[PDB]
Nucleic acid binder design. Structure first.
Lengths: 57, 199, 68, 233, 118
RNA sequence: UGAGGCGGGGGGGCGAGGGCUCUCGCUUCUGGCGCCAAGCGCCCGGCGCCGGGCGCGACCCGCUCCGGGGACAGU
RNA sequence: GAGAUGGGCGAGCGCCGUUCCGAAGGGACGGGCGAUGGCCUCCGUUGCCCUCAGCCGAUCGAAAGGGAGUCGGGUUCAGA
């Protein structure tokens, strides 16, 4: 609808029940979740490889 | 007894630049703490076409290091850049196409574009379609550096001022002949009232 | 009183003291606007010699004119 | 004992790692035009070769003796506006039924009693804005043999005489019990200002380079001194 | 105290309230747009009568500078009849004409005879 | 440039041979997130309970906001 | 595109310029304190101290651009 109409409608007509719903498509949300978990685990994998760096040097 | 045409062009108001649809000022990212010491990571949000400018522009998005806010700059697309590819900016930035870093760190025979000609002026040299600049010689003392320019003249510029690596995109724009006066009419219409030139 | 001294001191505009004090004010005045009110007169000697008296209602405006 | 949910979460302030905290920025503020001017006019009093007639007010009286100077003078304050009308009602009854010595303020009254050599100690203020109003004075008290000194602050000088400020204050006469109290001030002052004259006439203040430059010469003055210190050995 | 922002903004200073030692005008000017300078006269048009019989509205020539609100309460005071809606326009000759639609519990005829027009 | 970490001086971390000279003050695989302090210490205010402050975290010191020119441009 | 303030120029009426040589915000939240109003309850009013703020250029500029929301039937010598 035209932008000013959005005052009239209720909430559920303007969004969808999901995290980032109504703003991001679901496909680019599961991609965002899959990303934001794998990057953090890559930080933990390197954090115990750096922990095994100065254990020698 | 009459003011000639080339004399009227400095008054403007008919020979002014047509800047209604121009995207913005194609500059670098200003000097700050990160750019001097470290590197700062930026995403290429998308690539766009600036009317009048033969090169394409690039919307790079950085994360501001002092406020919780994302800052966006308009870069001059080095050829080979694609969206989503990360651009790194600063002294400690790695050397790979599409990366700004001061000339004094880059080695000899490096091919750069969007070069600065005064430290902290956000790029002025070699920023047309397909024009690059080569860093010839260095000088640790005096912080100077000889750089040949797309015209052929070499300029002794300081080493603190930076440039983005690679050649400017849109190269080879001048190989395709204009065939008709219509195409030439449409090109100069996007830039300024100059085209049909009476001898 | 002292005004005779300051009078005779201001006639020595090529001496080291005056050539110091004039090059400072000329720098200081230059970093301001072209028309602004001085609180108290720069030359109290020349002021009273021109009719200035220190009393409520006497005002002094320091202004710069582009020479040439 | 302690709740094990209390976990220390650091913020790594690296380059582009986390956002910098609200650290102090009182060095890079774009100050207003009037403050910016207010300071770099003081740098000019530490850059250019200040002539000796103006440099001579940087050298000032020390603190611990200046507390004696004002306290001695704190009884010699002239009569206030309130005591003036009370000193005119005393005369109002002596018809209906000697003045002690006081201070002397104002340059145009002090110089008129320095030329007559009536003063004993002329106190000046180092911070008068159109400095031309004073600069003749210390060279003239020395000539006619009147002990002078320079006190830091025309405001606290202008607190004895109840005004906003004052430039000079003179001791024409004193009492007898404070007579010798003055004598110990004169000798300690004359040995620093009057007899110390020829040194003051040739003291050029300023010619100092900035701390960002004297550290730049020295980094090349220590490096040059690093070469010739191990060449012979 | 420290500086967090690298800029300098002017501080908020105590700006007092206007407290004059004498009123600039000794007398408050009386409202020249009162209730009688706001309704000049009704209409005696063969169309205005048609407007009275059928649509139950009165037609006045009100002043050129009156709101619909002001016209509504003016009639409500001069003729003690409540107004349902007002419609105004400006005739070409210049004076403003007003169609005062009376409330349905009121009658436009028997109040038109209260003021003579018929 | 939203004048945001300038010059010094101390500090730890990576080396050849415990001081001095040197590198460094923590980010590169991915179209993710990032602010409005965690935590510790020293005090105080309200009937064991409920509410506050300063400091470390975020080193200290300074005179031009940093840069580039400059007694020449310029007027 | 037009055009004030700051600034700059100008013998001068004035001109230049529009973010550029500028202390360019009269706001919001929270907290604290005194105070009033109605069952001074609770909320609202009000000051002061504390707290956070990017604002970025006054203002003008379209009856074809942007711009929430009316349609059906009847009625007049002329208006829907």
């Amino acid at each position: 609808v035209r932008p000013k109409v959005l005052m009239r409608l209720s909430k559920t007509k303007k969004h969808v029940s999901r995290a980032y719903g109504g703003s991001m498509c679901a496909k680019c949300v599961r991609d965002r979740i899959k990303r934001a978990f794998l990057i953090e685990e890559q930080k933990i994998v390197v954090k115990v490889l750096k922990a095994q760096a100065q254990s020698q040097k | 007894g009459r003011v000639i045409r080339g004399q009227r062009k400095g008054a403007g108001s008919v020979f002014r630049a047509h800047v209604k649809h121009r995207k913005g000022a194609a500059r670098l990212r200003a000097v700050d703490f990160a750019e001097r010491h470290g590197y700062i990571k930026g995403i290429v949000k998308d690539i766009i076409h600036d009317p009048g400018r033969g090169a394409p522009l690039a919307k790079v998005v950085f994360r501001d290091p002092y406020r919780f806010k994302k800052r966006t700059e308009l870069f001059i697309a080095a050829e080979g850049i694609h969206t989503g590819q990360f651009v790194y900016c600063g002294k400690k930035a790695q050397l790979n196409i599409g990366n700004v870093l001061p000339v004094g760190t880059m080695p000899e025979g490096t091919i750069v574009c969007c070069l600065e000609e005064k430290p902290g002026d956000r790029g002025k040299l070699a920023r047309a379609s397909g024009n690059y600049a080569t860093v010839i010689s260095h000088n640790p003392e005096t912080k100077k550096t000889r750089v040949k320019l797309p015209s052929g003249s070499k300029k002794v510029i300081s080493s603190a001022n930076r440039a983005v690596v690679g050649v400017v995109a849109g190269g080879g724009r001048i190989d395709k002949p204009i065939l008709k006066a219509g195409r030439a009419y449409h090109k100069y219409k996007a830039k300024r009232n100059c085209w049909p030139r009476v001898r | 009183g002292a005004y005779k001294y300051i009078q005779e001191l201001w006639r020595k505009k090529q001496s080291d003291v005056m050539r110091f004090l004039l090059r400072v004010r000329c720098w200081q005045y230059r970093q301001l606007s072209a028309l602004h009110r001085a609180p108290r007169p720069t030359r109290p000697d020349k002021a009273r010699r021109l009719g200035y008296k220190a009393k409520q209602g006497y005002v002094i405006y320091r202004i710069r004119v582009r020479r040439g | 004992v302690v709740n094990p949910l209390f976990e220390k979460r650091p913020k790594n302030f690296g380059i582009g790692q986390d956002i910098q905290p609200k650290r102090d920025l009182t060095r890079f503020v774009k100050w207003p035009r009037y403050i910016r001017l207010q300071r770099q006019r003081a740098i000019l009093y530490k850059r250019l070769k200040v002539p000796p007639a103006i440099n001579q007010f940087t050298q000032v009286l020390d603190r611990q003796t200046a507390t004696q100077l004002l306290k001695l003078a704190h009884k010699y304050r002239p009569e206030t506006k309130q005591e003036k009308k009370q000193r005119l009602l005393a005369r109002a009854e002596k018809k209906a039924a000697k003045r002690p010595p006081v201070l002397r303020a104002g340059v145009n009254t002090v110089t008129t009693l320095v030329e007559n050599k009536k003063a004993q100690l002329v106190v000046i203020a180092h911070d008068v804005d159109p400095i031309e109003l004073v600069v003749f004075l210390p060279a003239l008290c020395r000539k006619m043999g009147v002990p002078y000194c320079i006190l830091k602050g025309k405001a606290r000088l202008g607190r004895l005489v109840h005004r906003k400020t004052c430039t000079t204050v003179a001791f024409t006469q004193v009492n007898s019990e404070d007579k010798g109290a003055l004598a110990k001030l004169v000798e300690a002052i004359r040995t620093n200002y009057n007899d110390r004259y020829d040194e003051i006439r040739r003291h050029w203040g300023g010619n100092v380079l900035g701390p960002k430059s004297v550290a730049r010469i020295a980094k090349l003055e220590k490096a040059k001194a690093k070469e010739l210190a191990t060449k012979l050995g | 105290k420290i500086r967090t922002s690298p800029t300098f903004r002017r501080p908020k200073t105590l700006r007092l309230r206007r407290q004059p030692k004498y009123p600039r005008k000794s007398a408050p000017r009386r409202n020249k747009l009162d209730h009688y300078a706001i309704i000049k006269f009704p209409l005696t048009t063969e169309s205005a009568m048609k407007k009275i019989e059928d649509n139950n509205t009165l037609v006045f020539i009100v002043d050129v500078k009156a709101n619909k609100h002001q016209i509504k309460q003016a009639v409500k005071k001069l003729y003690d009849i409540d107004v349902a809606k007002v419609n105004t326009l400006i005739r070409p000759d210049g004076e403003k004409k007003a169609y005062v639609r009376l409330a349905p519990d009121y009658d436009a005829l028997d109040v038109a005879n209260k003021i003579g027009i018929i």
